[PDB]
PDB file of C-alpha atoms and ligand atoms in Angstrom:
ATOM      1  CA  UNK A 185      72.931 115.358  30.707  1.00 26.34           C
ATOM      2  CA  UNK A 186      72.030 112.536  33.047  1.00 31.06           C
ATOM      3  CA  UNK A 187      73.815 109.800  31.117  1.00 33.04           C
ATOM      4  CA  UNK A 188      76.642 111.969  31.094  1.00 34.20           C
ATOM      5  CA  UNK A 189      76.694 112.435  34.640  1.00 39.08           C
ATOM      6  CA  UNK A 190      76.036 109.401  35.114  1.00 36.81           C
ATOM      7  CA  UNK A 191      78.796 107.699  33.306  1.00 37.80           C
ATOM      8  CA  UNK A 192      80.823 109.746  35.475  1.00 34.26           C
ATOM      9  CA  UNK A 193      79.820 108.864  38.615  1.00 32.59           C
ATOM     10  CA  UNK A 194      80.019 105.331  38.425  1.00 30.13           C
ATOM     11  CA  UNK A 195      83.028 105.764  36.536  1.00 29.39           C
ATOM     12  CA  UNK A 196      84.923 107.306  39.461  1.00 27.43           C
ATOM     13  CA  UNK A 197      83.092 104.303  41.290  1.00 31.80           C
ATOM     14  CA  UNK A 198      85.062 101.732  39.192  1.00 29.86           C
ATOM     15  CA  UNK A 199      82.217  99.771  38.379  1.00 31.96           C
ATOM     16  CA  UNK A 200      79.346  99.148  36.353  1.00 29.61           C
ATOM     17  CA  UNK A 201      75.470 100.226  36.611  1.00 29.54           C
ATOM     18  CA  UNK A 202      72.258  98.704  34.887  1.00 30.14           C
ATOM     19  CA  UNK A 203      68.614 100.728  35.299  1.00 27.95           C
ATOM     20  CA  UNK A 204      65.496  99.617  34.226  1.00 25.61           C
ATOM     21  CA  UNK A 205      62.756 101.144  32.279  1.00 28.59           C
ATOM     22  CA  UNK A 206      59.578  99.536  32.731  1.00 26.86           C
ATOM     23  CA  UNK A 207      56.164 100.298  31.775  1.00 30.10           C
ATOM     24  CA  UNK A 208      52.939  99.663  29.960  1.00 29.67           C
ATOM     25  CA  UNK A 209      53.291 100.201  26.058  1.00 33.37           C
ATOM     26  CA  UNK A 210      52.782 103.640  24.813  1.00 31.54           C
ATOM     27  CA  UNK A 211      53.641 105.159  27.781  1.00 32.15           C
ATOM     28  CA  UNK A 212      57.132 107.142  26.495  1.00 33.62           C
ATOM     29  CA  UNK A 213      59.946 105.029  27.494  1.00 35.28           C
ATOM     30  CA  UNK A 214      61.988 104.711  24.169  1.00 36.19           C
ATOM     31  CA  UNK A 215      61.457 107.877  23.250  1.00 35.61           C
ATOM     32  CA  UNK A 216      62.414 109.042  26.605  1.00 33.01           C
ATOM     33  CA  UNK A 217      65.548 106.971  26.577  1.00 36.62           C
ATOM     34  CA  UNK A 218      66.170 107.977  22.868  1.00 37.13           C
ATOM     35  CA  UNK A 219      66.223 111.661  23.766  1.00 36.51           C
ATOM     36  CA  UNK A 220      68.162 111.593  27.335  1.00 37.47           C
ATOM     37  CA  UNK A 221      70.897 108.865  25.593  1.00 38.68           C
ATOM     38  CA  UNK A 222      70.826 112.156  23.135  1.00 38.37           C
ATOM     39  CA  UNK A 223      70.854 109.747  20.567  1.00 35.05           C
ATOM     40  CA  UNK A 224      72.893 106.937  21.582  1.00 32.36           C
ATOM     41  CA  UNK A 225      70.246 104.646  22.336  1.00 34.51           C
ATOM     42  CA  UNK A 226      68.125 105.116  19.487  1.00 32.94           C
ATOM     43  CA  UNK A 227      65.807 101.875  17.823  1.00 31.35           C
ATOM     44  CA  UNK A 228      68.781 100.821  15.641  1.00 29.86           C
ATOM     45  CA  UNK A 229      71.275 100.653  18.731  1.00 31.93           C
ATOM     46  CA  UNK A 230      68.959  97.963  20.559  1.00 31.33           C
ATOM     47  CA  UNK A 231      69.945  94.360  21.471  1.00 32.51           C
ATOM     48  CA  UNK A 232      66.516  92.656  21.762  1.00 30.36           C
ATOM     49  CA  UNK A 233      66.234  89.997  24.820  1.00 32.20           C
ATOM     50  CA  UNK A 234      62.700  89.341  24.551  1.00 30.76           C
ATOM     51  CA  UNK A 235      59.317  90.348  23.004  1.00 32.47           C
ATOM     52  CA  UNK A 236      58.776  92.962  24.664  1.00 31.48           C
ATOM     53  CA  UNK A 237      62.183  93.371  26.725  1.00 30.37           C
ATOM     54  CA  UNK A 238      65.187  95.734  24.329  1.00 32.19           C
ATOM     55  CA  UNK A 239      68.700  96.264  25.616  1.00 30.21           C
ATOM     56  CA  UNK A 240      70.836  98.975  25.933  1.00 31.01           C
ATOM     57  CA  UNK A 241      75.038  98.745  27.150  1.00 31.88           C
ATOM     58  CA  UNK A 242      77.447 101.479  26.591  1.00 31.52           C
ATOM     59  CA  UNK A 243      80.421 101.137  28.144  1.00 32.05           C
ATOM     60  CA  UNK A 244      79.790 100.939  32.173  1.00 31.12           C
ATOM     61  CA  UNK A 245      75.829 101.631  31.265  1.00 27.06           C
ATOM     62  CA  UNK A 246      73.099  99.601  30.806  1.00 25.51           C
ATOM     63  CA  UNK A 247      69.192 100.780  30.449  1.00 23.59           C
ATOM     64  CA  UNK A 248      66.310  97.727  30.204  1.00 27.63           C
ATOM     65  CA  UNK A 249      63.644  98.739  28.538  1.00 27.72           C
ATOM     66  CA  UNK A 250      60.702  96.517  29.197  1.00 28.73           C
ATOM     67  CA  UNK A 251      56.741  97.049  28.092  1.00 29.88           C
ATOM     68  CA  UNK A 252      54.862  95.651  30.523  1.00 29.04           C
ATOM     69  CA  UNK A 253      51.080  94.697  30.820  1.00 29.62           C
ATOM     70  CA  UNK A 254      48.754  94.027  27.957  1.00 29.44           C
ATOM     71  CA  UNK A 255      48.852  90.004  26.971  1.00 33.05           C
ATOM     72  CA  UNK A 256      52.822  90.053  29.023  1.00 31.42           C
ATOM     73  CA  UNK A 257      52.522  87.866  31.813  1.00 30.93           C
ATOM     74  CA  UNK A 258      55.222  88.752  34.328  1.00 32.73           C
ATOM     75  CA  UNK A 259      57.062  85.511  35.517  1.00 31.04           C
ATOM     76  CA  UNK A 260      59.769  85.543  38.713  1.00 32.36           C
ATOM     77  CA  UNK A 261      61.863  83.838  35.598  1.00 31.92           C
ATOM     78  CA  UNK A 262      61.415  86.551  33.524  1.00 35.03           C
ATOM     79  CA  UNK A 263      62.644  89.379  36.123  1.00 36.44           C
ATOM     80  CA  UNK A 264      65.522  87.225  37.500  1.00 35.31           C
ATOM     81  CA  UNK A 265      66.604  86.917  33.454  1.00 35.90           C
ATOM     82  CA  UNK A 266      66.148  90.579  32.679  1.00 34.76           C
ATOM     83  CA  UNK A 267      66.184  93.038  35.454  1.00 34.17           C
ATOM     84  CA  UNK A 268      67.798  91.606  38.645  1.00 35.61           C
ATOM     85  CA  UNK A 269      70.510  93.474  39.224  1.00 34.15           C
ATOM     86  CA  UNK A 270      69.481  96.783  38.558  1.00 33.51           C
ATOM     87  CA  UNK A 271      70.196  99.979  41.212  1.00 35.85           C
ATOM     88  CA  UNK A 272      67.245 102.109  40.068  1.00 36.91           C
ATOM     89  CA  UNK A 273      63.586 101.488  38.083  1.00 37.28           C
ATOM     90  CA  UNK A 274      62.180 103.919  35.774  1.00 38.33           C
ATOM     91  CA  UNK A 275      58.298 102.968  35.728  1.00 38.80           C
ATOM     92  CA  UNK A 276      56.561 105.423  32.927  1.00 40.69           C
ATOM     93  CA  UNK A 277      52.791 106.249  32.585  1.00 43.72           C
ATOM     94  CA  UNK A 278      51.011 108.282  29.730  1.00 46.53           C
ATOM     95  CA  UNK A 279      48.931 110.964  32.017  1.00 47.13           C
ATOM     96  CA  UNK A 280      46.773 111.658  29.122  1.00 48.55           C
ATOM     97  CA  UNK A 281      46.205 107.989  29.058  1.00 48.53           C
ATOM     98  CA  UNK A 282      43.701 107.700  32.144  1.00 45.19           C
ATOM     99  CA  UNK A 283      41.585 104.397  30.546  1.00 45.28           C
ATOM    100  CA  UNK A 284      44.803 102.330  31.342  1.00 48.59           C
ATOM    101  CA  UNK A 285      45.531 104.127  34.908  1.00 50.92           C
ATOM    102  CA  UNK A 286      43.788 100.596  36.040  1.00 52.76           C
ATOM    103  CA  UNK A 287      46.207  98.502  34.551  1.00 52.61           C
ATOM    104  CA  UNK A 288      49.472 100.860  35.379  1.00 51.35           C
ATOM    105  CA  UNK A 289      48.561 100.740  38.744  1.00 51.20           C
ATOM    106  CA  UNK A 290      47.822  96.381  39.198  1.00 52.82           C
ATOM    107  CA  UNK A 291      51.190  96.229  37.278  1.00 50.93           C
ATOM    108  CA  UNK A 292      53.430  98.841  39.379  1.00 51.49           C
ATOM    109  CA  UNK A 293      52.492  96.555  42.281  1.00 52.04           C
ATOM    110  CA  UNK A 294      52.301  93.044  40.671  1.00 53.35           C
ATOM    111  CA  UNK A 295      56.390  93.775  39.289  1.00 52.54           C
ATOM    112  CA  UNK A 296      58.069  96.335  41.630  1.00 52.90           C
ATOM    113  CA  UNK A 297      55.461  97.477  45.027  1.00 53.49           C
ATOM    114  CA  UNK A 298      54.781  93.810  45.995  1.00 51.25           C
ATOM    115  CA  UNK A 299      58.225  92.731  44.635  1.00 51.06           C
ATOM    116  CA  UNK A 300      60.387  91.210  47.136  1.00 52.74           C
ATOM    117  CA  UNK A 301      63.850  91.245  44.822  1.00 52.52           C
ATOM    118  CA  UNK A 302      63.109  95.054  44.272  1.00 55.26           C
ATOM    119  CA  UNK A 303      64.322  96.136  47.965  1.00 56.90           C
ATOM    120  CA  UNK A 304      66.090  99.541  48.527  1.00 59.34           C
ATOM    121  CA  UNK A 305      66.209 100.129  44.835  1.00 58.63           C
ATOM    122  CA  UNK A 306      65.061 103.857  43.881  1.00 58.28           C
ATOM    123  CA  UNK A 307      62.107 103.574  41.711  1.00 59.45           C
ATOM    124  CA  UNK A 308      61.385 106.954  39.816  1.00 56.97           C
ATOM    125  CA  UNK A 309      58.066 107.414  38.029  1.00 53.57           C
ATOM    126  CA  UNK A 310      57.547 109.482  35.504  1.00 52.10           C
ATOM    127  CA  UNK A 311      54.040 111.498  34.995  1.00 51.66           C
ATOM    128  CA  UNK A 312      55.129 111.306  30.774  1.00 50.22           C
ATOM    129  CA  UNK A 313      53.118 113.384  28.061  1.00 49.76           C
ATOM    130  CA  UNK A 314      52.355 116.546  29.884  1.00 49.32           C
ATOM    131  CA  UNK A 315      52.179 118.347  27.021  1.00 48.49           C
ATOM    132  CA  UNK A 316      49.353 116.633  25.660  1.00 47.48           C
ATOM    133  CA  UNK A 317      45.916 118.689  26.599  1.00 47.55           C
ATOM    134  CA  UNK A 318      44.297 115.590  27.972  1.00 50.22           C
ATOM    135  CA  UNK A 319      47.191 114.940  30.661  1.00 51.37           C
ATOM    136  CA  UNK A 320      46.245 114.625  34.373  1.00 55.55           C
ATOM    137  CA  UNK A 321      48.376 116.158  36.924  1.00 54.06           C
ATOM    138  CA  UNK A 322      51.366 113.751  38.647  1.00 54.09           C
ATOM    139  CA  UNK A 323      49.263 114.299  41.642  1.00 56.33           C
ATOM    140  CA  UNK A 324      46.669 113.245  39.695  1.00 56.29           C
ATOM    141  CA  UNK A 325      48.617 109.845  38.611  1.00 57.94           C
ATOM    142  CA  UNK A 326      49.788 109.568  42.119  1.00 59.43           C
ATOM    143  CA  UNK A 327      46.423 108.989  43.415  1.00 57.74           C
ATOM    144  CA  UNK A 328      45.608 107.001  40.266  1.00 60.52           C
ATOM    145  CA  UNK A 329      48.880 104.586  41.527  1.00 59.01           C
ATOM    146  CA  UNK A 330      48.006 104.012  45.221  1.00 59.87           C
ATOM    147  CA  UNK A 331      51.248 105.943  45.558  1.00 59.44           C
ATOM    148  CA  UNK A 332      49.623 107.273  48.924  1.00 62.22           C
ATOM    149  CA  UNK A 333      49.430 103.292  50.326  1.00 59.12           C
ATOM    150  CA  UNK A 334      53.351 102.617  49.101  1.00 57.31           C
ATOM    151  CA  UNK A 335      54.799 102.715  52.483  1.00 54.77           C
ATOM    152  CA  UNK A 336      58.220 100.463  52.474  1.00 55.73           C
ATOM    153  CA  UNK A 337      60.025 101.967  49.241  1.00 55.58           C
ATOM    154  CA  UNK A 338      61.997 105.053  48.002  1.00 53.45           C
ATOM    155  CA  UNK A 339      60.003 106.961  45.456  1.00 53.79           C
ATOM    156  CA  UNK A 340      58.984 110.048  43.622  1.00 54.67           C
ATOM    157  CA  UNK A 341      57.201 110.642  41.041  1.00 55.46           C
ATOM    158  CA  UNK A 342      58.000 113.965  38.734  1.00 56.18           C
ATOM    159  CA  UNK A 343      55.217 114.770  35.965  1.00 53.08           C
ATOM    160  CA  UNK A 344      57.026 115.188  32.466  1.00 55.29           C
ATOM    161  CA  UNK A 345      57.151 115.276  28.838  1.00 55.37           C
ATOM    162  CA  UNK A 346      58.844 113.117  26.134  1.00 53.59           C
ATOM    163  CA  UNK A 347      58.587 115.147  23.193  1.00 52.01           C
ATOM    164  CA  UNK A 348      59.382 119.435  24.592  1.00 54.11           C
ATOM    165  CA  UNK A 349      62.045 117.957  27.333  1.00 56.34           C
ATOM    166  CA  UNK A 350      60.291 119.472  30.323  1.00 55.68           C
ATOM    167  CA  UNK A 351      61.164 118.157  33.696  1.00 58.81           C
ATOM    168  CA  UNK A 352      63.150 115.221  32.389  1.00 54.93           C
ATOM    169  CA  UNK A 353      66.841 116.120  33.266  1.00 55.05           C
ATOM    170  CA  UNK A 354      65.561 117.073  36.707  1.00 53.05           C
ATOM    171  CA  UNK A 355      63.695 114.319  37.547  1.00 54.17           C
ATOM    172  CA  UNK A 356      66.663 111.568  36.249  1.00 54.63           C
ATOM    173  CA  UNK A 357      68.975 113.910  38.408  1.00 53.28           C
ATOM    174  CA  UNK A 358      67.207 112.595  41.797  1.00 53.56           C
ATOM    175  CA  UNK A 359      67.541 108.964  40.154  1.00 53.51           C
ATOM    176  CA  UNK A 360      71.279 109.574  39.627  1.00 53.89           C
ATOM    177  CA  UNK A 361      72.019 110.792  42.766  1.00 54.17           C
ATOM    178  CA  UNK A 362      70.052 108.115  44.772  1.00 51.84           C
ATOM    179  CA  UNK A 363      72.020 105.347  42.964  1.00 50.45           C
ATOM    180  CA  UNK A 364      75.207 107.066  42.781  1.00 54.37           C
ATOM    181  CA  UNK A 365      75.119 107.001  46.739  1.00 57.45           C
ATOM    182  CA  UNK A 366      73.816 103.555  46.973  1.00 56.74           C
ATOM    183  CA  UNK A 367      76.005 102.072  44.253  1.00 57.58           C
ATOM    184  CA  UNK A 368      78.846  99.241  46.097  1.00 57.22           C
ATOM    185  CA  UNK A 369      76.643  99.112  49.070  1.00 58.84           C
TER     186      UNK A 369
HETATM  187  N1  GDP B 657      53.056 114.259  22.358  1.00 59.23           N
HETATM  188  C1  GDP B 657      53.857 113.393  23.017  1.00 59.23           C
HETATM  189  N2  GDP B 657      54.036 112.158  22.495  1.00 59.23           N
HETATM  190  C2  GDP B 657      54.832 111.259  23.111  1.00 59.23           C
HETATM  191  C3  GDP B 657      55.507 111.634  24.357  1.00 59.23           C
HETATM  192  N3  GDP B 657      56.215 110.559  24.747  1.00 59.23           N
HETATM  193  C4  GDP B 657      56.018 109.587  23.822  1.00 59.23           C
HETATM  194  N4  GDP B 657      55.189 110.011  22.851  1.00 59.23           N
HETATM  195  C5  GDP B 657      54.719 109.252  21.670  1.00 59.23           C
HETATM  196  O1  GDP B 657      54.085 108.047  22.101  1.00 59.23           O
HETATM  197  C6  GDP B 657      54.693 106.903  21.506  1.00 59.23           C
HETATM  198  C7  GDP B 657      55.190 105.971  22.597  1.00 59.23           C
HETATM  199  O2  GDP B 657      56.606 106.043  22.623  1.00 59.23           O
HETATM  200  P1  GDP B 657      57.508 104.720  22.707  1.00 59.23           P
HETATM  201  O3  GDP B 657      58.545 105.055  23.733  1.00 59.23           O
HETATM  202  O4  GDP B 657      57.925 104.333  21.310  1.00 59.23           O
HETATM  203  O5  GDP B 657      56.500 103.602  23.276  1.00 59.23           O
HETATM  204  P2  GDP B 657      56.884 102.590  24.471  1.00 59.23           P
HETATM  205  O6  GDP B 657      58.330 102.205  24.301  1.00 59.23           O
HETATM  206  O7  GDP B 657      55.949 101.437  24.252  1.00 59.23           O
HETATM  207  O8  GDP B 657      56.589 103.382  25.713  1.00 59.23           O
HETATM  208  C8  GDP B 657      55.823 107.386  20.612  1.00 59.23           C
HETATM  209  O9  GDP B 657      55.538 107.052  19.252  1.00 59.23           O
HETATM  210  C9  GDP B 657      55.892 108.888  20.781  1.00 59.23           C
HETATM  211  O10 GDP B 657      55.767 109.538  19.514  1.00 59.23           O
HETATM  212  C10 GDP B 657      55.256 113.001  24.859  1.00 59.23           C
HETATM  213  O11 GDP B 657      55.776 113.408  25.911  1.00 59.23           O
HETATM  214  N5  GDP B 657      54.444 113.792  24.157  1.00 59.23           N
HETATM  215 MG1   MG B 658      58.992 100.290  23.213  1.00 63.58          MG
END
């Protein structure tokens, strides 16, 4: 697991680590932190900080999940309150969600591209809901993102799915290791 090895890792670190999980509603990220937590962050496990921000601690861990978009207004306030501090961002899209591609895109900019607190911080995006028929390719999301113009962060974006497991552990595994090497630096 990743928030096996993750525990772990920042465990032999001595310290403590806090990722965020942002994206617009629908996308996957509960689910997705449901099933990789196998379990252990589940709905009736969350402390709620906001109306659309849920919290997650477990020991040395702590996830932020935060929906994003929609009537949300995202406020410097806001970010400093919920997820400054973190030492990697999850941002999640639904690929067979193309409609909203618009809106993930102005909103991966407006909170993390075009964010001057996020700074070295590895952001991981997630091409969720492969398995659904209607699913463009991570390539496809990629272009859809303006991932092409993001010049001055640390990326990658790995296509997955929520609900058959595919590509999840791998993709969380180049998360892990990018904050495990930047964690107490
Ligand atoms: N078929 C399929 N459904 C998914 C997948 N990921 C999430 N879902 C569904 O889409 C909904 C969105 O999940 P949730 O994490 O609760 O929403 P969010 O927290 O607003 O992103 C859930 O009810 C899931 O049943 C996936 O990979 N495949
Ligand atoms: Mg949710």
């Amino acid at each position: 697991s990743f928030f096996k090895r993750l525990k772990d890792a920042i465990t032999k670190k001595k310290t403590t680590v806090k990722v965020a999980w942002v994206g617009l509603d629908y996308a996957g990220k509960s689910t997705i932190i449901k099933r990789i937590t196998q379990g252990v962050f589940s709905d009736d496990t969350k402390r709620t900080l906001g109306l659309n921000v849920d919290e997650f601690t477990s020991d040395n861990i702590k996830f932020v999940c935060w929906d994003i978009g929609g009537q949300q207004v995202f406020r410097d306030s806001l970010w400093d309150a919920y997820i400054a501090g973190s030492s990697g961002i999850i941002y999640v899209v639904d690929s067979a969600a193309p409609e909203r591609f618009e809106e993930a895109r102005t909103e991966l900019w407006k909170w993390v591209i075009e964010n001057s607190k996020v700074g070295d911080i590895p952001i991981l995006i997630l091409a969720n809901k492969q398995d659904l028929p209607e699913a463009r390719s991570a390539g496809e999301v990629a272009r859809a993102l303006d991932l092409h113009k993001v010049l001055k962060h640390s990326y990658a974006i790995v296509p997955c799915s929520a609900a058959s497991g595919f590509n999840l552990e791998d993709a969380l595994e180049w998360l892990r290791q990018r904050i495990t090497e930047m964690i107490l630096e």
